[PDB]
């Protein structure tokens, strides 16, 4: 039971890590390029 | 073991929740200020 819980938690951590990386990358990309495009 | 798992989960939640606050602050700031520079 503890192993299954930890595996699910690790999958969730990986997903959240990837999604925050993507969101921060999108924010930096929108800051990098000019506005009126 | 359960205390360690709960501590890891709480540490994850704190980072998630602070990241959500940080993202929403930037979103609100960008909503307040008009797009043109
Ligand atoms: C979940 O999200 C997390 C984001 O919050 C993410 O963690 C971060 O991921 C980044 C990549 O996506 C990591 O960036 C890497 O940085 C490498 C450079 O590391 C050098 O510095 C280390 C220590 O520096 C720290 O402290 C200084 C201040 O002194 C600070 O400015 C830095 O930002 C760091 O915080 C060195 O580690 C050594 O020292 C520590 C103790 O401080 C020891 O514990 C270590 O064992 C070790 O002895 C390290 O050796 C490096 O010198 C990038 O490496 C580039 O540069 C080196 C030369 O420095 C080249 O040789 C490489 O080829 C490469 O070009 C690397 O590419 C990457 O950019 C970031 O470090 C992560 N942060 C933490 C805290 O871990 C998680 O990864 C993510 N989860 C998953 C699963 O992905
Ligand atoms: C870190 O993350 C945190 C969670 O992600 C976050 O906290 C969240 O903040 C939100 C607001 O920013 C909160 O949403 C509000 O919810 C109000 C409703 O609250 C009522 O229920 C409370 C109890 O909730 C429990 O039960 C529900 C199911 O009903 C469950 O979903 C919850 O998870 C809880 O288990 C009541 O609190 C009472 O009981 C607790 C103990 O359980 C006591 O400690 C309290 O002191 C209190 O006695 C509360 O009183 C409410 O009854 C929304 O209120 C609407 O509805 C009420 C009627 O119910 C109206 O009167 C209001 O006018 C309004 O219309 C409110 O609008 C908002 O949506 C969210 O609940 C928080 N989550 C948690 C877990 O607390 C943190 O903000 C975040 N950190 C930072 C820095 O942001």
Comparing CA positions, the residue from B5, B26, B8, B3 lying closest to residue A26 is B26
d(CA B35, CA B23): 18
Q: Does A36 touch chain B (CB under 8 A)?
A: yes
> B30-33 contacts: CB < 8 A, separation 24 or more?
none
User: How far apart are the CA of B17 and the centre of ligand 2, in A?
Assistant: 15
User: How far apart are the CA of B10 and the centre of ligand 1, in A?
Assistant: 23
d(CA A15, CA B9): 15
Resolution in A: 3.4
Question: Which of B12, B14, B15, B17 is the best mutation target for the ligand 2 pocket, counting ligand atoms within 8 Å of the beta carbon and taking the most?
Answer: B17
């Amino acid at each position: 039971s503890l192993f299954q819980t930890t595996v699910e938690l690790q999958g969730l951590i990986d997903q959240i890590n990837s999604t925050y990386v993507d969101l921060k990358l999108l924010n930096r990309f929108e800051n990098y390029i000019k506005w009126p495009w």
